[PDB]
Write a protein that binds this ligand. Structure first.
Ligand SMILES: [Mg+2]
Ligand SMILES: [Mg+2]
Ligand SMILES: [Mg+2]
Ligand SMILES: [Mg+2]
Ligand SMILES: [Mg+2]
Ligand SMILES: [Mg+2]
Lengths: 319, 319, 319, 319, 319, 319
């Protein structure tokens, strides 16, 4: 009676019944900005990735928007790192600047700024360290200061990736109090402590990791906890919720989709990306086929948005 | 705390989180075929809709596929009508000849053929009429022959729209018995007796409708019964299932998609088509906007394939 | 074993098993009031629709109630439009007046008043515009002022159709503070930005649309968002929740029914209405069959109340 | 109030509430067998992965079981290839001889045998090719013989990876017909057409792939179809069901486990394996960490058995 | 078609498909401390159980941690009992002391302290008694005082087993106010009034029971109530929720697992433990087989943590 | 706001809302029958449990029914054991003779007979042993004969406890084939391989257990498999389904009752019985309290019928 192959006999039928499709509007492009003028830097562990100066960031975004890309995620590489990470909320920082410069040249691009104290502190953690402890409530306080500054600079969205407890609520409360109740918040709800963040550390020249971040980042073994985390975030006001990493966490994505009916974002981390790059370089796989497909999978798992370093290459492929 | 508008502030943002999009691969074009050579007649009640001769129809398909449209729904309009409606399964019928020519000229186009005795009988009914009674099992025996015949000519798919009991099963058996287990079946699982069918009858030269098809077509007040019908056909072997009509039956489509894990199809019926045509002709509505939008709504509801007379105008727009 | 047609063999059985029925109590009649005396105006894009003077509004309602209709929805057409739309909360406005006049003559009719700043502002939006921005929190403030005035005038219900964030809560808070905790609130929970609102603009002589309302009105592609919207509204205190438009959004209606167990309303917008009018005028469909049936569909989708310009014609048909 | 971090403050706490752990009893080791005596060849695209002769393979198994690994997946690589692929069911085939020797040397090791015509045919396909068509029912008839043959040699389990329609059923019948109702069946229920299979083909000396297996292998965009496929096989008699590939299809695995109450299996495909190999060789990722972690993710998703080329390196690590 | 035994034919397969496993990290070891130096006491009704002096408690924990055990549960046996049970929050009590001494010697062990006024009051109840009434809100007040002291002493977690209403919220509020918002709370959510607590009374030399505790402890007949209880606790801030007793309450454990997605703990009470001890002493059962298995059952029911007096013997068995 | 204790303040209140109660109609009494006349032997490992001769057994039943107990589970203990275990279906077997005498003396007592080859074979197994293999289909053929034989003697019910594949089906067919469609079937759907069975073996003079029954009895770590097993038997025709053992498998019982809408039965196994016996004999536990309570827990979990050796002591207590 049943012969599933009937729906595969031809590309037409296959084309007709396909449950999911990937589109440019599903892509968000991370951007690493640095101090200086007229300069871009190839990232060693991330072939194809780059550190941009602001003036070069603007140049890129201009190409981005023209290719279809709808938003990016700004990472700020400060010249100096401190223990109190106060540079985060300096309105004259590279990040704030880039925010300003970009919003002006390509105003129709959704700028999303990264919120975390890793690139600004000398211990490799996303929060303030005291006596070996990543201080929770104290870190949010800076995170708040930080976020408000991004808004002041013209940030469209903020994306706290800190995994500190109850930071989405505090941050949202601050944005409201400074007339920024319209700036969205994309929160890293289910960010796990993963061995996939390798190539990224070197990308922004972040201080030595110095002890895992497993005191706030999630245990990769855990699922139920992801539901606990997301829910708390939505209740706090998160406009969108994200899972990180992505490729090997598609079950966490599907689950968030089925339960919360809020937009769901996912991160194609440096490792999954750098991994396909290295295998292709040896001729063991197809860069194009593998990259795109793995994006399809993220779409089939329920993701709506996808932070991917392949974002620009995928937009040309869909052009 | 919450502010849904935050996801609407900007085209970018709006483009990123949009839950559904419409694509060319969602569209199936109804093609009306008539006897004769090199000719075309617009349908009075369906502006921009025409009947084609085989020659003209083959060329049209060429333009169809070129635009990306993946499939067509072949509708036959025999020269003579009979009470036993035997022409339906004639190897030289105008329909059959269309199947043969099309598959040859445009092999890559998935050809779905309509299966029903409506255009082949004088009573304007989808089945055989005895004494004011539209016979079920008798009618099905003529449908089988029809389906095989269509398969014998090169059909890729048949779409029984009769609403006879146990017709999907019988047909699936006949098709397999004649070495056509590769030929799928698209079942009008839930076809209601609607007043949304007006303009269509003239399209094919209908016949003394005589009474009404409410003894086999479903009452538009019922939803549960639609779940019974579909489950019955899926159990029978239907590869795909369709709801008819479409615009005003999106709740049935959402229910279908939500429960049966099989491809779901909807029908942008003639009455829906003409209605935009008319309103637009008065300047009360924007034809292109309402048409495309109404297609979107069908995607939002859970439809994978859309049988629409606007198929060609959408493929361009989607181009 | 199974033969679904057994339940369709006769009108008796069909009559017995029918899942849903439409009744007069499912209908609500919109009423467009204007300044002046003894005068009614045919609406160009809405054949059968009219602008009534108060004295003629009262005359109509008297006929309405006698035909069975249980409530109407008052729209107020001011003589002058301002940027601050302060006329909305003028207790001497046409709307308030009509409220008073009607409540007196036909006190047993549930008056529902429209809350929005579109007919009162010169930019064609339902809220206050500043620098191209439809101001959210500022608009509610007027909406509150407005609502309280409707209550003071004797309004039974208020129906904010503004789609501003968190207006149901604010409005409800105001009604309570002014001894109007008994006045209900029918909120347009899931109001989409649609191409179906065509003929309505001209109806009330509303200022040129001047840019879509997609910054607050919902993306027609979205469903999950509709659940997010409704829930927020119910939590805020909405007595009833409505979806708009209706005909092509029946999946949004069914979904709200199954999830929230609060009364569910729907809108038969000008487009769906004007659409059946134009098609019938060409003889392409049956005005009666199409109008009523599409109302049946709304009932089968789960709607309890139905704002329809056919309300009066449907009540005669059910008389 | 809430503070998820409270469960992360300490290794103890973290160890207590961890939802999932990975064990040696989750692992199944793919073994590639080739003709000849005392020899071994590493796979170019799969570092640390080798082909074995029967003698070398028996010894390897000894080391396997000693490490706790409970099962193996025997892969055959015949000397000569044919179009009817008859060698597949030859009692003296290199595969069969491996089954016989292994069960004798290490009886306590559960031997699962691969069932597909890929290594036995020149077209590099899993079924019989007629005229560019991969035959289903014909191919299945050769699979049955294959399965019985394997059972006749002492196989404990067969794992049809062909993706032919109704193959589990046919095989289960053949096996029972020859007194092998004790021989289970591990079905590749949902095997997609992925670009994650690159390195594997060379492992066995693949053949003119010619076209693509997207007429029987599933489209990576679909999830619903995966539920259809599995349910079909469980209904057929499959003792266990597998998803392929693995890392990027964890949503399919969670869905499977969540709905079918039968043992679920996943595949750490070659492309996934090599990808860590490559990245690690560059020093971008920690090979041991990513490998083990990715295995964990598969446990978190709902996988019970893992076919992984890292099986031996995990058993040690888990030791 | 189906033969479940296929998955049991061998230990390998059995080993592969096993749904659940018990691990050291699933075990928590209760510890009874008493005043004095260099001394341990065999518990009469709990063969293998002991009362430890602090210096001997430290000695045990040192062995515990080395065997794998990740946390213990401290019970404090005061020399004097009062009616106001003020000794509970004496920072110089045996309990506080033991807390201090243990944290120092084996700092990497998760200390969990018991919160209740039974060992500190002369009426055998877990709260303050007035006129035959176990005072609810007054008892929490002490419970708060108590908890804060445990935190001050260095307690990792507190485990209120009092079954007083709304004590998890109050206690959590106190810990926060005294800079202990990082100390977790394992609450006895569903603690029933059971005949299984026999041997435990004598263990800590608790005052005569003097009337059941059925005025706060749960009716063993009740299930729905357990859902009511847990939910209230989670909403109050409980990090983990526990059911007590365990062996004959596995349905209450499974239910809490499926509903709340918070970590779930269970208690192997003195009775279930002392029961297996007595039956084995007569040669009527296997101490080892019965003890371990019943722990497996608790794991299969959904428990994550298990307070068991066999904890040390089970850790050797898993070593 | 909330205070669950409000429902515990008083015996009245507690008695009113109690979710479950235990009744005499929940109890089924296992009866062990042996050859000979007028004699009785207490079981060493089951104090208060005895074996009866037919005469003594008939009288016991008289006392049973008088106390309200509605049913019994007849256990046979043949004089001689054989490898083909043919005595099982001997019309003059000690079991059969018991059936005949009982039904005559106490017709109103529902007689359920045990169906398994354990007491009838020397290998102490429930099926036929060939070469260290417990044969399934062969064993079932002997079970059928057994069941019919029992029905032929006047049995009201048979309770296959063998855990053979497809035995319920075969037996149900045999029973119907011999005009016994009125004879129900109580299936040990989910009987685990537990160490809770110690005392029972001696009760019947077990035999060289030789190995273990883990090739047909279920692994105590699994729950999903229990759902597979039950559904399989219900599909086969089992009137009722049982879980074994009981106390420590209440999660399986709740799951059963929750999903299958068929009567559910549990088994207070020997190891559970003796365990209270022993602890009570030491004065560590109150035997009457723990016994009755543990029965309650079984009612709370969803059990309708309880096979317990405490049946008679409960009927009195419940009297
Ligand atoms: Mg969080
Ligand atoms: Mg039907
Ligand atoms: Mg809203
Ligand atoms: Mg399949
Ligand atoms: Mg409580
Ligand atoms: Mg079974």
């Amino acid at each position: 009676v049943h012969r599933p192959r009937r729906l595969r006999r031809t590309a037409a039928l296959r084309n007709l019944v396909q449950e999911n499709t990937l589109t440019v509007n599903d892509l968000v492009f991370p951007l690493f900005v640095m101090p200086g003028t007229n300069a871009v830097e190839e990232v060693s562990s991330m072939p194809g990735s780059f550190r941009f100066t602001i003036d070069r960031a603007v140049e890129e975004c201009k190409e981005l928007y023209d290719l279809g890309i709808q938003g990016i995620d700004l990472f700020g590489i400060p010249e100096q790192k401190t223990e109190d990470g106060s540079e985060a909320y300096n309105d004259n920082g590279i990040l704030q600047q880039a925010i300003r410069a970009i919003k002006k040249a390509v105003p129709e691009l959704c700028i999303m700024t990264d919120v975390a104290l890793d690139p600004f502190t000398p211990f490799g953690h996303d929060g303030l360290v005291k006596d070996g402890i990543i201080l929770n409530d104290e870190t949010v306080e800076v995170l708040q200061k930080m976020a408000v500054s991004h808004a002041e600079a013209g940030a469209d969205f903020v994306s706290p990736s800190d995994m500190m407890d109850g930071r989405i609520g505090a941050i949202r409360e601050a944005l409201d109090e400074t007339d920024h109740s319209d700036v969205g918040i994309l929160s890293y709800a289910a960010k796990y402590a993963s061995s996939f963040y390798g190539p990224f550390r070197d990308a922004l020249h972040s201080a030595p990791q110095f002890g895992d971040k497993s005191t706030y980042q999630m245990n990769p073994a855990n699922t139920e906890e992801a539901m606990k985390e997301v829910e708390l975030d939505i209740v706090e006001g998160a406009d969108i919720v994200m899972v990180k990493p992505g490729l090997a966490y598609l079950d966490i994505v599907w689950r968030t989709k089925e339960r919360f009916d809020v937009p769901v974002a996912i991160y194609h981390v440096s490792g999954e990306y750098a991994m396909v790059k290295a295998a292709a370089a040896k001729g063991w796989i197809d860069e194009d086929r593998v990259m795109m497909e793995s994006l399809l999978c993220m779409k089939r798992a329920g993701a709506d948005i996808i932070f991917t370093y392949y974002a620009k290459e995928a937009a040309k492929k869909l052009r």
